[PDB]
Scaffold this motif. Structure first.
Motif, PDB file in Angstrom:
ATOM      1  N   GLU A  42     -15.671  17.963  49.085  1.00 56.97           N
ATOM      2  CA  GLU A  42     -16.176  16.864  49.897  1.00 56.97           C
ATOM      3  C   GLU A  42     -15.373  15.591  49.638  1.00 56.97           C
ATOM      4  OE1 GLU A  42     -20.233  16.482  48.437  1.00 56.97           O
ATOM      5  OE2 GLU A  42     -20.891  17.610  50.284  1.00 56.97           O
ATOM      6  N   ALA A  43     -14.058  15.709  49.456  1.00 53.40           N
ATOM      7  CA  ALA A  43     -13.229  14.554  49.203  1.00 53.40           C
ATOM      8  C   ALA A  43     -11.809  14.810  49.693  1.00 53.40           C
ATOM      9  CB  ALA A  43     -13.192  14.241  47.721  1.00 53.40           C
ATOM     10  N   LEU A  44     -11.096  13.719  49.800  1.00 57.99           N
ATOM     11  CA  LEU A  44      -9.640  13.741  49.760  1.00 57.99           C
ATOM     12  C   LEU A  44      -9.236  13.332  48.340  1.00 57.99           C
ATOM     13  CD1 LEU A  44      -8.826  12.094  53.179  1.00 57.99           C
ATOM     14  CD2 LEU A  44      -8.187  14.393  52.518  1.00 57.99           C
ATOM     15  N   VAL A  45      -8.342  14.116  47.747  1.00 61.58           N
ATOM     16  CA  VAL A  45      -7.918  13.883  46.379  1.00 61.58           C
ATOM     17  C   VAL A  45      -6.401  13.872  46.304  1.00 61.58           C
ATOM     18  CG1 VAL A  45      -8.133  14.731  43.996  1.00 61.58           C
ATOM     19  CG2 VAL A  45      -9.916  15.218  45.589  1.00 61.58           C
ATOM     20  N   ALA A  46      -5.894  12.975  45.489  1.00 63.51           N
ATOM     21  CA  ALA A  46      -4.484  12.919  45.176  1.00 63.51           C
ATOM     22  C   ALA A  46      -4.343  12.934  43.664  1.00 63.51           C
ATOM     23  CB  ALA A  46      -3.809  11.666  45.745  1.00 63.51           C
ATOM     24  N   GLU A  47      -3.191  13.384  43.203  1.00 67.27           N
ATOM     25  CA  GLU A  47      -2.820  13.322  41.821  1.00 67.27           C
ATOM     26  C   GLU A  47      -1.562  12.514  41.668  1.00 67.27           C
ATOM     27  OE1 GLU A  47      -3.403  17.204  39.667  1.00 67.27           O
ATOM     28  OE2 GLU A  47      -3.271  17.859  41.761  1.00 67.27           O
ATOM     29  N   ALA A  48      -1.456  11.897  40.525  1.00 66.11           N
ATOM     30  CA  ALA A  48      -0.167  11.368  40.075  1.00 66.11           C
ATOM     31  C   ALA A  48      -0.334  10.989  38.646  1.00 66.11           C
ATOM     32  CB  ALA A  48       0.248  10.155  40.882  1.00 66.11           C
ATOM     33  N   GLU A  49       0.747  11.119  37.864  1.00 70.30           N
ATOM     34  CA  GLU A  49       0.785  10.618  36.480  1.00 70.30           C
ATOM     35  C   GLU A  49      -0.374  11.081  35.652  1.00 70.30           C
ATOM     36  OE1 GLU A  49       1.221   6.195  36.338  1.00 70.30           O
ATOM     37  OE2 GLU A  49       2.719   6.349  37.917  1.00 70.30           O
ATOM     38  N   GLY A  50      -0.826  12.311  35.834  1.00 70.77           N
ATOM     39  CA  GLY A  50      -1.831  12.883  34.949  1.00 70.77           C
ATOM     40  C   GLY A  50      -3.279  12.656  35.305  1.00 70.77           C
ATOM     41  N   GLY A  51      -3.552  11.963  36.415  1.00 68.57           N
ATOM     42  CA  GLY A  51      -4.938  11.728  36.797  1.00 68.57           C
ATOM     43  C   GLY A  51      -5.148  11.908  38.291  1.00 68.57           C
ATOM     44  N   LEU A  52      -6.355  11.493  38.687  1.00 71.03           N
ATOM     45  CA  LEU A  52      -6.904  11.764  40.002  1.00 71.03           C
ATOM     46  C   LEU A  52      -7.285  10.511  40.740  1.00 71.03           C
ATOM     47  CD1 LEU A  52      -9.342  14.617  39.427  1.00 71.03           C
ATOM     48  CD2 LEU A  52      -6.979  14.793  40.244  1.00 71.03           C
ATOM     49  N   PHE A  53      -7.046  10.514  42.033  1.00 67.77           N
ATOM     50  CA  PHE A  53      -7.413   9.446  42.955  1.00 67.77           C
ATOM     51  C   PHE A  53      -8.293  10.097  44.021  1.00 67.77           C
ATOM     52  CE2 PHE A  53      -3.469   8.464  40.962  1.00 67.77           C
ATOM     53  CZ  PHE A  53      -3.455   7.098  40.773  1.00 67.77           C
ATOM     54  N   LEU A  54      -9.463   9.527  44.256  1.00 68.26           N
ATOM     55  CA  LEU A  54     -10.494  10.153  45.072  1.00 68.26           C
ATOM     56  C   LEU A  54     -10.942   9.238  46.186  1.00 68.26           C
ATOM     57  CD1 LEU A  54     -12.429  12.721  44.795  1.00 68.26           C
ATOM     58  CD2 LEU A  54     -14.051  11.165  43.715  1.00 68.26           C
ATOM     59  N   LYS A  55     -10.898   9.751  47.422  1.00 68.81           N
ATOM     60  CA  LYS A  55     -11.592   9.164  48.576  1.00 68.81           C
ATOM     61  C   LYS A  55     -12.722  10.139  48.912  1.00 68.81           C
ATOM     62  CE  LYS A  55      -7.805   8.716  51.173  1.00 68.81           C
ATOM     63  NZ  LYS A  55      -7.182   8.477  52.491  1.00 68.81           N
ATOM     64  N   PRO A  56     -13.919   9.914  48.347  1.00 70.75           N
ATOM     65  CA  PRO A  56     -15.036  10.827  48.627  1.00 70.75           C
ATOM     66  C   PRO A  56     -15.378  10.767  50.098  1.00 70.75           C
ATOM     67  CG  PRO A  56     -15.651   9.187  46.998  1.00 70.75           C
ATOM     68  CD  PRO A  56     -14.329   8.789  47.480  1.00 70.75           C
ATOM     69  N   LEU A  57     -15.763  11.909  50.661  1.00 72.96           N
ATOM     70  CA  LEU A  57     -16.166  11.969  52.065  1.00 72.96           C
ATOM     71  C   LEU A  57     -17.685  12.222  52.191  1.00 72.96           C
ATOM     72  CD1 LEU A  57     -13.102  13.938  53.368  1.00 72.96           C
ATOM     73  CD2 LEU A  57     -13.411  11.445  53.401  1.00 72.96           C
ATOM     74  N   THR A  58     -18.423  11.784  51.190  1.00 71.51           N
ATOM     75  CA  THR A  58     -19.875  11.910  51.072  1.00 71.51           C
ATOM     76  C   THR A  58     -20.660  10.919  51.902  1.00 71.51           C
ATOM     77  OG1 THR A  58     -19.706  10.419  49.172  1.00 71.51           O
ATOM     78  CG2 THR A  58     -19.730  12.745  48.678  1.00 71.51           C
ATOM     79  N   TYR A  59     -20.004   9.874  52.395  1.00 73.42           N
ATOM     80  CA  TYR A  59     -20.538   8.583  52.819  1.00 73.42           C
ATOM     81  C   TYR A  59     -20.687   7.686  51.602  1.00 73.42           C
ATOM     82  CZ  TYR A  59     -21.189  10.556  57.431  1.00 73.42           C
ATOM     83  OH  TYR A  59     -21.000  11.189  58.651  1.00 73.42           O
ATOM     84  N   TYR A  60     -20.565   6.392  51.871  1.00 71.46           N
ATOM     85  CA  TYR A  60     -20.481   5.357  50.859  1.00 71.46           C
ATOM     86  C   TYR A  60     -21.600   5.406  49.858  1.00 71.46           C
ATOM     87  CZ  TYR A  60     -19.355   0.454  49.430  1.00 71.46           C
ATOM     88  OH  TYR A  60     -19.036  -0.720  48.777  1.00 71.46           O
ATOM     89  N   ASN A  61     -22.820   5.613  50.369  1.00 73.72           N
ATOM     90  CA  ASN A  61     -24.022   5.498  49.559  1.00 73.72           C
ATOM     91  C   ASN A  61     -24.300   6.734  48.690  1.00 73.72           C
ATOM     92  OD1 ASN A  61     -24.277   3.097  50.986  1.00 73.72           O
ATOM     93  ND2 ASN A  61     -25.913   3.833  52.304  1.00 73.72           N
ATOM     94  N   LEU A  62     -23.451   7.751  48.790  1.00 75.03           N
ATOM     95  CA  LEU A  62     -23.668   9.038  48.165  1.00 75.03           C
ATOM     96  C   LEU A  62     -22.498   9.466  47.295  1.00 75.03           C
ATOM     97  CD1 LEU A  62     -25.413  10.786  51.161  1.00 75.03           C
ATOM     98  CD2 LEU A  62     -26.517   9.936  49.096  1.00 75.03           C
ATOM     99  N   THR A  63     -21.582   8.557  46.997  1.00 73.69           N
ATOM    100  CA  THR A  63     -20.369   8.952  46.288  1.00 73.69           C
ATOM    101  C   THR A  63     -20.629   9.466  44.884  1.00 73.69           C
ATOM    102  OG1 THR A  63     -20.087   6.706  45.628  1.00 73.69           O
ATOM    103  CG2 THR A  63     -18.870   7.431  47.601  1.00 73.69           C
TER     104      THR A  63
END
Length: 186
Positions: A42-63
């Protein structure tokens, strides 16, 4: 790899209707980083430099539904979780790192606090100000920025992109020293 060293979470809502709205500032910042996002659960996820970047697709109030299981799974300590979000308690043109503390009514931050059972995670608060009357708050956060605000939003996005990389690579205190005093207003 099998482990993640950090988690950066951008607050926002899914869909084009929301993409230019004040409540999608966190997504906008992540989209400036130059990463390759991929759909995972339920997200868009990216990696770089050993960690994670998350754009949750849950809606704002449910992240929290996405953030908490991920952070627990990867054993990510609170000082290696950064929630990037629009903040009505700061004016447009102010940017602030915050270690812990309250959600101040922000439903995304609250969802994450409730799901993790801690407030201690880090935040990058991107001021958006307030509507002229509180009764318009819902509409305010689901509206685009005004014509006269666009130059300031652009500066804020530039600063916030750099600030995210700062926090990833340096941790919160040096980044608070560089960014928290900035005045990006017109």
């Amino acid at each position: 790899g099998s482990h993640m060293m950090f988690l950066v979470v951008g607050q926002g809502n899914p869909g084009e209707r929301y993409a230019r709205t004040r409540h999608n500032l966190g997504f906008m910042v992540l989209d400036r980083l130059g990463l390759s996002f991929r759909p995972r659960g339920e997200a868009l996820v990216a990696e770089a430099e050993g960690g994670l970047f998350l754009k949750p697709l849950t809606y704002y109030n449910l992240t929290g539904r996405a953030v908490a299981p991920l952070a627990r799974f990867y054993k990510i300590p609170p000082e290696r979780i950064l929630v990037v979000h629009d903040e009505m308690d700061l004016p447009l043109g102010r940017i602030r790192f915050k270690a812990g503390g309250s959600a101040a009514g922000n439903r995304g931050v609250l969802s994450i606090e409730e799901a993790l059972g801690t407030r201690a995670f880090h935040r990058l608060r991107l001021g958006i100000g307030k509507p002229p009357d509180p009764s318009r708050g819902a509409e305010y956060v689901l509206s685009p920025f005004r014509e006269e605000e666009l130059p300031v939003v652009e500066r804020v996005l530039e600063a916030a992109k750099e600030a995210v990389w700062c926090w990833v690579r340096e941790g919160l205190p040096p980044c608070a020293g560089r960014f928290n005093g900035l005045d990006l207003s017109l």
